[PDB]
């Protein structure tokens, strides 16, 4: 209220220190939360008067309040406040000047108006002029730097004045002033207009000719660091100057090294590396004080060289760079650490994504260890830590490097570990390096060092620090496997190490409220020891094992305990776990209830391995409890758990078939339900088939073959295609389990033959089952199969026909000599059915054994060649696919023939042969890799000139190869680029038009090729942009912007995708890229047109807007008229 502010103002000039700190706080609180003009003026005047007081607390409170005050006030108040602050800043009182500077800084920070900034900048420009006082100059420079850091978008027409006023400060006698003006110029460089940078660079270049003044070099480095992309065009005029000035005697190479490093880090594109590489190499060597930091800068300069550039790895290796780096390893710590870091960066860059880099690195390995040997005797912990890190990195980058150096390196590790002055970090690093070396080296070069490696490890195990204990436990676990590797034979008496290693481990087994990591490491070490050296342990093996039970109750070490049990169960050695089986198996059954995928899998695997290894000692009691948790685990929600459960059930049935009458409760129902699961695929299907086969072999009441068949195909007699496949495969597997199932085939034949009282589903299922069961057994013995199959081929629906064709193809694999010729002659016999029979043949080549298919190859090839030239397009496609599939076998015998057919083949033959090889490409590696790579050359290069269909098929094959395997078109991309670019051009000879009135319709016979070319161009962006040029690539896209609707959308999507890739090229031509796009967007729908055209043009316009919006992330971009203004909100 008015009275509130009136009394606050009255009490503000109270003359009591505490009555002028409460009123100000109340005013600040009231202003912070969301006031007449007279009240505003009065409060502003009071605040300004109070800004100068005889107490610091009130002054600070007023300064703080000045910030929020400007947040809600008119412009005139801010203008007058700024004016009075600037006038006070000119006063000779230091306190008032500091208060004004702080207030102005706070006001600037509060701000994100324009007039205030202009006035402030003008005042600073006027004040910064050459003056006797220095405090005001420094304050103005600080304010200007803060403003530039905060705001750098406005004041475009003030940059030249600021630069001119700041330039004289460069030659100031005070180094602080020089640094401040350099920082201010660097900050202002970001704001700027663009024409000022060239003038500044020219001025600096002409002023470089000066006496011993390092200010210019510092300013150059600062501006380069603040903006490297704007200075890359003037390196040729700067590099020579620094190169010539490097010859001076005074110690000033630090700035040259720093600016070289900055240029290397920021500006990657340049070819002056060797010019300065030798200079840096010679600089790092000389020494004679102030000569250490120059060496440090020289050493650090190579960090950018070794990190950024990667294609130049071999020239680094061949040069003397690594040699000098390794040689200079016996210097002071400051430069030694930087040398270590630089070589570590080089090693990291060595790892990639005549001689390879790895081979060259190994040759120098002997020169490194020796250089580090003396470093192992240094008393500085930093040097030892650096050496350990270097050894770890060298072992990690490539194993098998330090094979003939273990004898000379182990003593250093032992000496470092035994040292009392070694810190925890040094010991941890040494232990990690030792573990890495042991885990990446052959066990055969560590037996002699066991006596020198076991005592120190045991000693390190007994350490109050927990990380060192964990590292020692890990080292012990690794040594347990290294000393007695079960994968390979060994001969070494390790018995003397059995006691101590156990003593240091069992003592750690009893956690007693210890760190979880320590408990896990101890459990893992104990499990590994039990698994490996289980026979050596005497009477201490059983009791300690009992402790594992105590670890199965708490959830802190449940996963680790389960993993240890699983590892122990599976091992060549025979370990007695029966005493903990009866009490152990039930507990595991309790882990399947709680929702834990990892725990569930671990416990399932543990139970499976325990049952497999220990089947003689089992009881139905715990088995019943275990089986109770299966029904809620086999479900379509999770597939990984279902496979594990199926495998566990199969193992239990195999090694314990007695307890099979309890699963009938719900497990069988769940399995039956999962059989018809659409997601049933992968290893789960194989596991279920194996389980069914094992169940059939075992045999149980109510679970016989007939019962299984009735349960499986019960509902069908009384929906997804994968369900039919699963049922058919299960039926085939069950039939295979019983080699005497004669009645089943005759029953299926009778059911299929009876057209009446048999819907499509039953016939489909019967055909699928017959096809699945006729693969692994011969059906030639039973007659009446071919007749019924041929009769079923002719049906109204297509699913039944496809199923019959698939069944015939699968059956033909069984007895090739009796089935293949029959279908071969039948194909030529009837012309109205071969179209189906050919499809069946497609299965044979994909299902029949190659060794058995060798004799019947010439006939198939001749038939395919004879049928290659056919009027039907579908038949041509089928024969092309069959030829492509057959080309996989014996490529060395067919590839030359295919090459020959291209010399005098017809258009249809050429199209068929090129289509055949298209399907040969697969994502995964194939043995026809080099053969196809060599063969595709002439196929892609000299087969796009003559014909149109040949061109289309060649383009389709090229696109398919690029999408699947782009390595084949990697070495010949340029050889085919001209043809692909030519194919993109539009031809007006292949555009027919028919007009029969006002309406018009244009038909293009060549539009298919253009779409294929555009798709190939788009798909080529995956991993080929680094090779193909950009300027020659976007010209055709620019031409194609004005093309068909589908091509228009494809080009728009191409442009959208190109926004994040090489934006500089897109920005350099945005004008001409968008001009056709603007012309298209300025199009109007033809009058008196159907709604289809309106909608089509609407989607085209929306796509164009999306493309331009993506590209944006000023050629008359502001064209928002009355109507179009309502469109963008629908796009964003």
């Amino acid at each position: 209220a008015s009275y509130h502010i009136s009394n606050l103002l009255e009490k503000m000039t109270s003359s009591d220190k505490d009555f002028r700190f409460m009123a100000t706080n109340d005013l600040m609180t009231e202003l912070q939360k969301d006031l007449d003009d007279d009240s505003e003026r009065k409060v502003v005047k009071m605040i300004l008067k109070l800004l100068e007081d005889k107490n610091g607390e009130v002054q600070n409170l007023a300064v703080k309040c000045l910030g929020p005050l400007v947040s809600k006030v008119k412009e005139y108040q801010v203008e007058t406040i700024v004016d009075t602050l600037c006038t006070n800043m000119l006063s000779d009182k230091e306190q008032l000047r500091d208060i004004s500077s702080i207030g102005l800084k706070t006001v600037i920070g509060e701000l994100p108006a324009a007039n205030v900034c202009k006035k402030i900048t003008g005042r600073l420009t006027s004040a910064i002029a050459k003056q006797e006082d220095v405090s005001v100059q420094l304050e103005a420079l600080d304010i200007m730097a803060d403003m530039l850091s905060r705001q750098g978008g406005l004041l475009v027409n003030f940059h030249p004045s600021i630069l001119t006023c700041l330039l004289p400060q460069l030659t100031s006698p005070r180094l602080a002033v020089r640094k401040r003006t350099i920082i201010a110029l660097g900050h202002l460089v970001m704001s700027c207009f663009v024409d000022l940078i060239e003038h500044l660079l020219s001025e600096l270049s002409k002023n470089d000719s000066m006496s011993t003044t390092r200010t210019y070099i510092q300013c150059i480095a600062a501006i380069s660091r603040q903006a490297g992309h704007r200075i890359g065009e003037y390196l040729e005029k700067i590099i020579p100057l620094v190169v010539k000035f490097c010859n001076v005697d005074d110690d000033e190479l630090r700035e040259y090294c720093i600016q070289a490093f900055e240029s290397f880090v920021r500006r990657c594109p340049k070819e002056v590396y060797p010019h300065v590489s030798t200079i840096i190499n010679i600089c790092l060597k000389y020494l004679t004080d102030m000569s250490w930091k120059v060496r440090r800068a020289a050493a650090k300069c190579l960090d950018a060289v070794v990190s950024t550039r990667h294609e130049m790895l071999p020239e680094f290796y061949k040069t003397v760079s690594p040699a000098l780096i390794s040689r200079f390893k016996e210097r002071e710590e400051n430069v030694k650490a930087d040398v270590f870091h630089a070589y570590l960066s080089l090693l990291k860059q060595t790892r990639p994504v005549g001689e390879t880099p790895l081979t060259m690195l190994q040759s120098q390995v002997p020169n490194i260890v020796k250089a580090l040997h003396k470093q192992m005797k240094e008393k500085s912990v930093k040097t030892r830590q650096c050496c350990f890190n270097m050894l770890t990195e060298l072992v990690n980058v490539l194993p098998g490097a330090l094979t003939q150096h273990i004898p000379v390196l182990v003593p250093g590790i032992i000496f470092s570990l035994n040292d009392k002055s070694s810190s925890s970090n040094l010991k941890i690093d040494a232990l990690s390096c030792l573990y890495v070396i042991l885990c990446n080296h052959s066990p055969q070069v560590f037996h002699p060092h066991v006596q020198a490696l076991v005592p120190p490890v045991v000693a390190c195990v007994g350490d109050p620090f927990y990380k060192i204990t964990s590292e020692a436990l890990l080292v012990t676990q690794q040594l347990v496997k290294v000393i007695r590797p079960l994968d390979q034979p060994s001969s070494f008496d390790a018995t003397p190490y059995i006691k101590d290693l156990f003593t240091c481990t069992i003592k750690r087994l009893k956690a007693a409220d210890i760190d979880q990591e320590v408990k896990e490491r101890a459990i893992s070490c104990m499990g590994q020891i039990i698994c490996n050296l289980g026979d050596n342990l005497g009477s201490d093996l059983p009791n300690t094992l009992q402790i594992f039970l105590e670890r199965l109750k708490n959830e802190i070490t449940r996963l680790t305990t389960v993993k240890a049990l699983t590892l122990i169960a599976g091992s060549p050695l025979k370990i007695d776990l029966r005493p903990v089986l009866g009490e152990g198996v039930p507990i595991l059954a309790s882990f399947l209830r709680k929702n834990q995928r990892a725990l569930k899998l671990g416990t399932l695997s543990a139970l499976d391995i325990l049952i497999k290894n220990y089947s003689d000692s089992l009881t139905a009691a715990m088995i019943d409890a275990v089986l109770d948790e299966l029904p809620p685990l086999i479900s379509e929600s999770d597939m990984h758990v279902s496979q594990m459960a199926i495998s566990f059930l199969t193992t239990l049935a195999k090694v314990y078939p007695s307890s099979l009458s309890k699963i009938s409760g719900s497990i069988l129902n769940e399995l039956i339900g999962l059989v018809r699961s659409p997601l049933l695929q992968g290893g789960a299907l194989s596991a279920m088939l194996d389980f069914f086969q094992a169940l059939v072999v075992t045999g149980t009441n109510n679970l016989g073959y007939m019962d299984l068949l009735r349960m499986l195909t019960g509902p069908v007699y009384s929906t997804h295609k994968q369900s039919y496949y699963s049922i058919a495969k299960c039926v085939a597997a069950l039939t295979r389990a019983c080699p005497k199932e004669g009645p089943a085939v005759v029953g299926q034949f009778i059911q299929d033959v009876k057209n009446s009282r048999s819907t499509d589903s039953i016939r489909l299922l019967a055909l699928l089952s017959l096809g699945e069961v006729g693969h692994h057994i011969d059906l030639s013995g039973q007659l009446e199969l071919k007749s019924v199959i041929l009769e079923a081929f002719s049906s109204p629906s297509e699913e039944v026909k496809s199923a019959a064709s698939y069944a015939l193809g699968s059956i033909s694999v069984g007895n090739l000599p009796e089935y293949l010729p029959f279908v071969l002659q039948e194909i030529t016999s009837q012309p109205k059915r071969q179209y189906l029979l050919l499809h069946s043949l497609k299965e044979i080549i994909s299902s029949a054994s190659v060794v058995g298919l060798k004799p019947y190859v010439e006939n198939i090839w001749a038939l395919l060649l004879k049928h290659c030239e056919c009027a039907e397009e579908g038949t041509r496609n089928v024969v092309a696919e069959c030829l492509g599939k057959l080309t996989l076998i014996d490529p060395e015998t067919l590839l030359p023939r295919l090459k020959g057919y291209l010399i005098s083949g017809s258009s249809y033959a050429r199209s068929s042969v090129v289509t055949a090889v298209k399907f040969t490409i697969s994502d995964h590696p194939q043995p026809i890799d080099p053969l196809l790579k060599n063969c595709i050359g002439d196929f892609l290069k000299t087969l796009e000139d003559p014909d149109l269909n040949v061109r289309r098929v060649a383009l389709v094959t090229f696109n398919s190869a690029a999408h699947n395997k782009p390595s084949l078109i990697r070495d010949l991309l340029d050889t085919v680029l001209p043809h692909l670019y030519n194919e993109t051009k539009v031809r007006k000879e292949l555009i027919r038009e028919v007009e029969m009135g006002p309406f018009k319709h244009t038909v293009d016979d060549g539009l298919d090729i253009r779409k294929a070319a555009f798709e190939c161009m788009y798909t080529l962006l995956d991993s080929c942009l680094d090779r193909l040029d950009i300027f020659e690539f976007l010209n055709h896209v620019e031409d194609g912007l004005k093309d068909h609707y589908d091509i228009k959308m494809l080009t728009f999507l191409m442009l959208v995708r190109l926004s994040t890739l090489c934006p500089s090229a897109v920005l350099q031509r945005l004008d001409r890229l968008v001009e056709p796009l603007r012309a298209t967007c300025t199009t109007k729908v033809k009058a008196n047109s159907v709604k289809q055209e309106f909608e089509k043009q609407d989607e085209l316009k929306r796509s164009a807007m999306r493309a331009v919006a993506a590209l944006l992330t000023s050629p008359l971009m502001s064209e928002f008229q009355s109507q179009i203004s309502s469109n963008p909100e629908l796009a964003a």
Partner: protein
Amino acid sequence: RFSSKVLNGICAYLNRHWVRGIYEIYSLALVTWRDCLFRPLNKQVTNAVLKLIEKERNGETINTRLISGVVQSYVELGLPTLTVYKESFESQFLADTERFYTRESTEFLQQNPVTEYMKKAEARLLEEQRRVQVYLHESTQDELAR
């Protein structure tokens, strides 16, 4: 469609002579086409496309013009009106894509780490966005996005 448009242009005079399925010539042609599509013929064509898209995800090159024309014909029918397009191909296509992607993700995660899974997820999402922007309706963009 060209013949229907020509006939409508010819006999607009008669088209503007009644006082009031639909009596419009273009509407009559569209109704006739919808009836011709209602019969089980569509069950083949609508099914056939489901293979082509699948082949597009198996490393094979398919003809986008045919699918584009089929989708255009489906959306144009139903007298924009997307009832037929929504109840004929949208639901089945979405279910097929869900099932295929779930199976692929399960198979990959069964024997591959998570970084590769993330990379192939990016690849598949980019390919799906390309397909939607190329030969699918805009209204479905969000539907298949989330």
